């Protein structure tokens, strides 16, 4: 019980900041996550034997795809850790528990193809789950891993606490479907402006956790420019593979997925930053003021893409 994970000094300091990169040493990523659980949650939150077994089985169920891989999972959990650590008193013990686990599991068994491609391929998952196809799959994979012998990290919760945390996880993972983000953010926008936003209202908390999940999910745009720029190559390697697979079904893909249109990536990143990323981190910062560093880094990266376009890089 007296066994802390500890990190080298540079990581011990940098892990607290929103723009932390977890590094290229895959074998340190489980320890980093357990470190983040122990500080966010407590050393008592999980049996270490059970947590370590859960983590290794989650790792094994991410695939070797360029972007939606085990690295993304730990990265997305770290951004949640940093939100939770900058908003100590806003979240319950059950929420702190659920959200780190939700972020770690949120893209389980991703194949590097969007919901649209699954529907166009007529994949069996698109028959089983008509909307939020992959996300319903990610949550399905999370429940399966929780039910493997020795992997039930929530075994010590009361029945009703267990139903509540699985409900926090289901809604957190469903919320990573960016098709749902547009409406969720607009409703949060209205609610904050008219002053109806109430964090004692569960339906409002659920909306706020949704936006946190989108923010953590998109957090590649909140890193230092060298990280954002090199992660962009990984995001596009998937998009362009999906484009290729569209052309093999006889469908012209959108330009974002057509490798023949790589030239326009800079203007494509602007659109994304203006239509999704900035609105996301703006409303997050209005609801949760200590998350302002994510909006600041997002805007620094917008200004870097503006420089790429002007030929200065
Ligand atoms: C979903 N998602 N997630 C994440 C992302 C990113 O992306 N994010 C970002 C990042 N950074 C780093 C990493 O990641 C996204 C998107 O969507 N994006 C996007 N992109 C693009 N668009 C368009 C384009 C184009 C390209 C080319 C041509 C034309 C057009 N591109 C839209 C959207
Ligand atoms: Mg996803
Ligand atoms: Zn994701």
UniProtKB/Swiss-Prot annotation:
The active site is at 68 (proton donor). 3',5'-cyclic GMP binds at residues 68, 269. Keywords: Allosteric enzyme, cAMP, cAMP-binding, cGMP, cGMP-binding, Cytoplasm, Disease variant, Hydrolase, Metal-binding, Nucleotide-binding, Phosphoprotein, Repeat. Abundant in the putamen and caudate nucleus regions of brain and testis, moderately expressed in the thyroid gland, pituitary gland, thalamus and cerebellum. A divalent metal cation 2 binds at residue 107. GO terms for cellular component: cytosol; glutamatergic synapse. Plays a role in signal transduction by regulating the intracellular concentration of cyclic nucleotides. Can hydrolyze both cAMP and cGMP, but has higher affinity for cAMP and is more efficient with cAMP as substrate. May play a critical role in regulating cAMP and cGMP levels in the striatum, a region of the brain that contributes to the control of movement and cognition. Homodimer. This is cAMP and cAMP-inhibited cGMP 3',5'-cyclic phosphodiesterase 10A. The gene is PDE10A.
